[PDB]
Design a protein around this ligand. Structure first.
Ligand SMILES: O=C(O)c1cc(Br)ccc1NS(=O)(=O)c1ccc2ccccc2c1
Ligand SMILES: O=C(O)c1cc(Br)ccc1NS(=O)(=O)c1ccc2ccccc2c1
Length: 90
């Protein structure tokens, strides 16, 4: 079996939102659920639904409830500067 890791840096200059929902928990992993067409993640085009979310900026997502993962993504999107996502491809 093959594992494909990609790291995606979004400058968030032309987009306010990532435009993602997330599914699953890692305090029992967390995956990209929906991607909305108008957001930074869709514009970049590399991340797809079912990709596993490993890290966003300095936060690891591998010991979190779904609710806490949504909370930390809210905090990151409301902070200035680029957003770096590391995912494992489905
Ligand atoms: O993120 C943006 O800059 C954006 C701008 C426009 Br115009 C439209 C959508 C955008 N982002 S999006 O991730 O697709 C998005 C974000 C929140 C939404 C809330 C309600 C309905 C659609 C939404 C789309
Ligand atoms: O920007 C995002 O796509 C986003 C995704 C998650 Br999961 C959590 C927070 C996110 N950013 S956010 O600016 O706080 C936000 C808040 C409310 C939203 C409501 C509908 C659609 C997108 C939203 C994004």
């Amino acid at each position: 079996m093959s594992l494909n890791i990609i790291t995606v840096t979004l400058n968030m200059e032309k987009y306010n939102f990532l435009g993602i929902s997330i599914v699953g928990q890692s305090n029992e992993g967390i995956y990209i659920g929906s991607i909305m067409k108008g957001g930074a993640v869709a514009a970049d085009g590399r991340i797809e639904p079912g990709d596993m979310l490993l890290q966003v900026n300095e936060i690891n997502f591998e010991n979190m409830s779904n609710d806490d993962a949504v909370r930390v993504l809210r905090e990151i999107v409301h902070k200035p500067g680029p957003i770096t996502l590391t995912v494992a491809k489905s």
